[PDB]
Design a protein around this ligand. Sequence first.
Ligand code: 6UM
Length: 291
Amino acid sequence: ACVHHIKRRDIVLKWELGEGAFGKVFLAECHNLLPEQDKMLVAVKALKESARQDFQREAELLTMLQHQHIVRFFGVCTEGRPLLMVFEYMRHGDLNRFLRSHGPDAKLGGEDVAPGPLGLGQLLAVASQVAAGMVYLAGLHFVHRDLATRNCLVGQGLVVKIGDFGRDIYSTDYYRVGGRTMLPIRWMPPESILYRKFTTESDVWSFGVVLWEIFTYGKQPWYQLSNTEAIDCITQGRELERPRACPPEVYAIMRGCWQREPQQRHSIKDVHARLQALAQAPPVYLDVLGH
Ligand SMILES: Cc1ncc(NC(=O)Nc2ccccn2)c(-c2ccccc2)n1
C-alpha cells in the first residue's frame, strides 16, 4: 500500500460540487499537498461506508494510474470518518456539461473558450486528449468499462482528463438490470452486450462513441431510441450517423472504432496519432476539412 495519506487538519471543505451513492464530492482547501503551492484547491470524495477493503484496493489502483490525461489522485484520509479520497479540482466540471454549455443549443464567459460553439480545432484538441489517456490505460493493460464524456473532466486551459465517477444526473446513460447493477449500453460494443466480454478492443468502440459525443456537443448516443431499441440496433450492426459538426476524415476515425470484429479495429495508439495530427494541424489544412 504505497497509497499517499493526508491528515484531516490539512483538508478544509468549502462546499459541495457533486453527489452519488458510494460518495459525495466537496471542493476543499488542502495545505502542504504540493511544495511552493502552500494551499491549493482539491475535490474531496467522502465515502458512504464493510467496503473499506474495497476502498483500499481502489486507492491502490488510483495510485498506480498517474498520467497527464488521467484525473490526478493525491491520497486518502483514513484518520477519522468518513473515509476521504482526495483528487485534483477541475474548474469546468465534466466533459459532458462542458460540451453542452459550449454547443449550438446553449443560450450564452470566454477565458479558455471563444464566443459561440466550440470550433473544430477545439473539439479535436478535446478528442486527442481523451485518446492520449486511453493510450496510457491500454498500455498498462487497464480496461475502463465506463468510458463516456460524463467520466472526463475539463480544467483551466481546456485540459481534458479521464476519471470514473458516480454521475446520477446521468441515470438515463445506464440500463438497470438486477435492481442494482447498471450498464452504459449506448457506449458498449456488441461483444459486451451479447457475450459480456470487456477488453482493450471494447474500450476503442467506447472511445469511438466518445468521439461522436464530442462532435454532437455532448448529446446522448441513440437518444431517439429506448434502451431495448438501442440494444437491438447495436447488436444488429447499426452505426451512429455522422454528426453535423463532424468532417468525413474524423467520421472515418469513428467508423474504424466500430468494426464489429474486435480484432479488426484500429489500436488506440493509432486513433490518437490520427487525432493528434488533426489537432496540431495548421488552420489552412483544417479550413479545407470544414465544409
Ligand atoms: C462542478 C464540478 N466541478 C468539478 C468537479 N470535479 C472535480 O474537479 N474533480 C473530481 C475528481 C474526482 C472525482 C470527482 N470530481 C465536479 C464533479 C463532482 C462530482 C463528480 C464528477 C465531477 N463538478
